[PDB]
Design a protein around this nucleic acid. Structure first.
Ligand SMILES: [Mg+2]
Ligand SMILES: [Zn+2]
Lengths: 83, 217, 71, 129, 101, 221, 132
RNA sequence: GGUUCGAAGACGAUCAGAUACCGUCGUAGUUCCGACCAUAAACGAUGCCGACCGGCGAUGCGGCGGCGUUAUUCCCAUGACCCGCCGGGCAGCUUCCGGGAAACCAAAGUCUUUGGGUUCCGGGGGGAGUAUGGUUGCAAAGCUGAAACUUAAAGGAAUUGA
């Protein structure tokens, strides 16, 4: 987003929905920022690190927030691939 | 949820689900809840897949553990069935319970007495608790729901496919979320089975209360 | 337009030409009838002889006599 | 009847992209559609696609990335001379930074910026931004 | 402005339905436009039954009924209060009124 | 004049832990306090009343006139807000309209016409905004063109800090309730438009409630 | 014609909400505690509020009175008829487990339990309601 | 050919009047056969062909798979129910698909991010579907169809009143 010289000029960079790959508008109030906790392999206990996801307003009220969160988690290997 | 033998579904937990009757969905089926259903019976009731119940329940447990301050998780049930279970969950974890009649504008109205401002919503039945979901449209607020086969997944981000109708089923599903949150946190051990009996969560209707008030007397 | 074919030019041209008569101001300027009916005959001004004076009464709310002249 | 096949194919992609679908099956596969989609891929608006042979007109399954605002067609195929490619790319495309007019020339099917460089005018197919 | 979806009538995919004479007037209304009503009535009203239950020659002769199907035009139906005007919302309710007793 | 915060992020702002409107706009937080906008963009925010409009409702004993004031606010460096408000006095109609205009300000995105030298002066691409019948379109123009538009979009785009813009309006624009709402929706869409610059995959920062969680547990109930 | 107004009901509900610790089932005891805790300028309104307090709190004891919910305190008050069950209502023996559910468990590894009795299936698919 | 009904008619009422509504009769007509007529709120007030874009439960015709009930007792095999699937068709309910001035619409969507093909047709309200010519018809009348003049509004959906 930079000029001829190479100076990043726009006053901020908006987030993009993990499911749809739309940019989450400055006032898309039905957009979520959901942290799914990362668990230690040997104990099964919380580490203090998380696998964060963003989703757009249209996707949520479409009713595809459930399957999209699921598929992102199953891609990361949080949910078992077998499922 | 998976790739781990520690978070794996135990032979103890299966008998608890079958005894409560959480594997049994409704007669009618939603189009976005097909992936959580094994098969339809002769009698025409849908059998919910208990692995896919467990995978989503652990995903929900993870999402609740990642929230740091435990008192900006609002737990909700408007009907009779959940009112005990959410208060038990609330006291046991530190989550803030809204039991019976969610007044419209607790997240939207600044001037209200009960102007709450949570970071995660856990809901018993989207059809009954439709107002907290429709209101969590106005605030950037992820939603968890005890969704039945009949449930619409509009404004629901992780739907745990269960029976949310039966009084035993609601009680246990709240109990296993309450326990997995505490285990993952590192408060209870996976070595020992949990102190609390799941009947501490169940809804005793006045009829059962009066019959037992004569029984024990 | 509607008919978009690459050899659809006489259709478009002829159609617009037919439909421009249904325009009021076009047909007014392009028929002879208006410039026959115009007293001045398509002129800026016109000279005439005064033959009587007239008091033309106004319409509703405006009540007055507008002092015109027959020419 | 089905007069234009590229018109159907681009409306199918456009409808699927708006609805937020992750891949779309555009049916009556043709040399012009494939050569259109290769150009669209080389700039990186679509993903990798897989063309499915039944012993007929084939099918195409296009893996969609959510970075495609519009993919349209111009019918009829107007004969764009090189100097007039300015007034075309002026009134079709959003800005002078991004977006492409793909037009079928002597050399082959290629975007306005390539055709301007190669010094060739030709018949317009469509646009994608 | 469009008031009904089904233009006050239960014709969808015909073109023509033969008309009927109203039972109050003799006004020609189409067969499906008309407000139809089926009155199944005892011949003897309410108290007459008791007097004819005693002054009958026979033993538990279940005295007959009177079956009359009535077609009303919309004006005759509204005037006789067989139907009434309704709210914009309530207009769409097609479930007939409960007849519990 | 003591502003005690009612909202959770009204607390984090007054405690000087969030130090930009970009922290808010990035995480799409609803701004319910009128004082957060007066905190950050307090200096350069300038009001202009677009119109006062008397709207009536019929009763059996006379009409009941109440006044509706349209207010466009914004620093001339990439924020506009348009607020409307009805009241029995024109004074409290303006006062409420100003407050609502502050509540609902958006960041505008600015780009270049062709060559990418200096600071961004025009709209990054062709954007259209609709309200009722009115359709306002904003097109990028070369440098030092000025704003080729009607007075109403001109003054909104002036306050937005866009210098160069060709415009084209259709519908019943005589209604300047819908005109300016159409312009504001057109302006507001510039940051919710995916150009090939916003292609680089996003890296996720902590939301300010997760960031300053431990502070908000002790600071207030 | 004895319908109590908003001022009676609201203020009585607020006093039950806060001071549930002292209020009782006797009228004259809670009349005195109400006079002590609350500044009510007239004596008639004092008796009206105290009268409502010792009618709501005579029904809190019964069951799920709506307009108030002191959750910890009302639930600890529901923890006065203590039914702590000794055997879990779930922890049972032989379970009737649907020949369809047999496979559902068998597609998980645990298709082999002691207390999974498979009841014969309901022949005749007549689970629907007539459209008459 | 003329049973019923019934424009014009004839009277009887009603009313200030009633050439009307109400009543009693009643001619052309209402019916059939053979020749004309070519218009209707001839309506979904919504051209036809093709593609894509949500959900749900019924319904009519055809096909396919499936526990079981029932009729042919002798049941193979046919019908009647029962539970799903596929393709056309008349519709329905639902929704922030999306559109629209709104009412409302899975099309009236896929439209300033504007182009799949093609026929007909509208350009403020009146004058006016009027005059005039031409044409079809036995006639009634149909199709084509202006101008001078006049006027700042007529109008569409929705809101609050009365
Ligand atoms: Mg007809
Ligand atoms: Zn009638």
């Amino acid at each position: 987003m930079q000029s001829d010289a190479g100076e990043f000029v726009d006053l901020y960079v908006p987030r993009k929905c993990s499911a749809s790959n739309r940019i989450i508008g400055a006032k898309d109030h039905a957009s979520i920022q959901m942290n799914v906790a990362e668990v230690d392999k040997v104990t099964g206990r919380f580490n203090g690190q998380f696998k964060t996801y963003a989703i757009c307003g249209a996707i949520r009220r479409m009713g595809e927030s459930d399957d999209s969160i699921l598929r992102l988690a199953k891609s990361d290997g949080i949910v078992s691939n077998n499922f | 949820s998976g790739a781990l033998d520690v978070l794996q579904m135990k032979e103890e937990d299966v008998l608890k689900f079958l005894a409560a009757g959480t594997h049994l969905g409704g007669t009618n089926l939603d189009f976005q809840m097909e992936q959580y259903i094994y098969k339809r019976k002769s009698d025409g009731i849908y059998i919910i897949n208990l692995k896919r119940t467990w995978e989503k329940l652990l995903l929900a447990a993870r999402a609740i553990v990642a929230i740091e301050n435990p008192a900006d998780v609002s737990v909700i049930s408007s009907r009779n069935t959940g009112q005990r279970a959410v208060l038990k969950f609330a006291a046991a974890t530190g989550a803030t319970p809204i039991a019976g009649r969610f007044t419209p504008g607790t997240f939207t109205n600044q001037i209200q007495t009960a102007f709450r401002e949570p970071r995660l919503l856990v809901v018993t039945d989207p059809q009954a608790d439709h107002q907290p979901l429709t209101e969590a449209s106005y605030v950037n607020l992820p939603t968890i729901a005890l969704c039945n086969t009949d449930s619409p997944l509009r404004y629901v981000d992780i739907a745990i496919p269960c029976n949310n109708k039966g009084a035993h089923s609601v009680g246990l599903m709240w109990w296993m979320l309450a326990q997995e949150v505490l285990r993952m946190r590192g408060t209870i051990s996976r070595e020992h089975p949990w102190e609390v009996m799941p009947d501490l969560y169940f809804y005793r209707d006045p009829e059962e209360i009066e019959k037992e008030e004569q029984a024990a007397a | 337009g509607k008919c978009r074919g690459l050899r659809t030019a006489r259709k478009l041209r002829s159609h617009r030409r037919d439909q421009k008569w249904h325009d009021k101001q076009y047909k007014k300027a392009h028929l002879g009838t208006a410039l026959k009916a115009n007293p001045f005959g398509g002129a800026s001004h016109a000279k005439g002889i005064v033959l009587e004076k007239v008091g033309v009464e106004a319409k509703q709310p405006n009540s007055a006599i507008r002092k015109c002249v027959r020419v | 009847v089905r007069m234009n096949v590229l018109a159907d194919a681009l409306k199918s992609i456009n409808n699927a992209e708006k609805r937020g679908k992750r891949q779309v099956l555009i049916r009556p596969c043709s040399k012009v559609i494939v050569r259109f989609l290769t150009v669209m891929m080389k700039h990186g608006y679509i993903g990798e696609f897989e063309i499915i042979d039944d012993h007929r007109a084939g099918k195409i399954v296009v893996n969609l990335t959510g970075r495609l605002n519009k993919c349209g067609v111009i019918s009829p195929r107007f004969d764009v001379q090189l100097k007039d490619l300015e007034k075309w790319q002026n009134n079709l495309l959003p800005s002078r930074q991004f977006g492409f007019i793909v037009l079928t020339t002597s050399a082959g099917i290629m975007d306005h910026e390539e055709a301007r460089r190669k010094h060739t005018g030709g018949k317009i197919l469509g646009f994608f931004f | 402005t469009k008031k009904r979806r089904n233009n006050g009538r239960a014709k969808k995919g015909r073109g023509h339905v033969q008309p009927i004479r109203c039972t109050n007037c003799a006004r020609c209304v189409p067969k499906d436009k008309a407000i139809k009503k089926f009155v199944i009535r005892n011949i003897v009203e309410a108290a007459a039954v008791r007097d004819i239950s005693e002054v009958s020659v026979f033993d538990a002769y279940v005295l007959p009924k009177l079956y009359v199907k009535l077609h009303y035009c919309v004006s005759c139906a509204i005037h006789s209060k067989v139907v009434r005007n309704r709210s914009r919302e309530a207009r769409k309710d097609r479930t007939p009124p409960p007849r519990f007793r | 004049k003591e502003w005690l915060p009612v909202t959770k992020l009204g607390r984090l702002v007054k405690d000087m832990k969030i130090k930009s409107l970009e922290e808010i706009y990035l995480f799409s937080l609803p701004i319910k306090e009128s004082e957060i906008i007066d905190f950050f963009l307090g200096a350069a925010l300038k009001d202009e009343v677009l119109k006062i409009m008397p709207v009536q409702k019929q009763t059996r004993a006379g009409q009941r006139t109440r006044f509706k004031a349209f207010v466009a606010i914004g620093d001339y460096n990439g924020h506009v807000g348009l607020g409307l408000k009805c009241s029995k006095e024109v004074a409290t109609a303006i006062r409420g309209a100003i407050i609502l205009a502050k509540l609902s300000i958006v960041p505008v995105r600015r780009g270049y016409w062709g060559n990418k030298i200096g600071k961004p002066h025009t709209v990054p691409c062709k954007v259209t905004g609709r309200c009722g019948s009115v359709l306002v379109r904003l097109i990028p123009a070369p440098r030092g063109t000025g704003i080729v538009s009607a007075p109403v979009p001109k003054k909104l785009l002036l306050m937005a800090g866009i210098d160069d813009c060709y415009t084209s309006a259709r519908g019943c624009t005589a209604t300047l309730g819908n005109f300016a709402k159409a312009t504001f929706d057109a302006i507001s869409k510039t940051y919710s438009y995916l150009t090939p610059d916003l292609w680089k995959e996003t890296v996720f920062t902590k939301s300010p409630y997760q960031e300053f969680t431990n502070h908000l547990m002790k600071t207030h109930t | 014609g004895r319908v109590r107004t908003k001022t009676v009901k609201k203020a009585a509900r607020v006093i039950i909400e806060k001071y549930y610790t002292r209020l009782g089932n006797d009228f004259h005891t809670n009349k005195r505690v109400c006079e002590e805790i609350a500044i009510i300028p007239s004596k008639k309104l004092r008796n009206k509020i105290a009268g409502y307090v010792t009618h709501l709190m005579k029904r809190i004891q019964r069951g799920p009175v709506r307009g108030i919910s002191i959750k910890l305190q009302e639930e600890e008050r529901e923890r006065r008829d203590n039914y702590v069950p000794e055997v879990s209502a779930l922890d049972q023996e032989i379970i009737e487990v649907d020949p369809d559910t047999k496979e559902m468990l068998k597609l998980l590894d645990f298709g082999s339990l002691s207390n999974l009795q498979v009841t014969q299936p309901t022949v005749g698919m007549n689970f629907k309601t007539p459209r008459g």
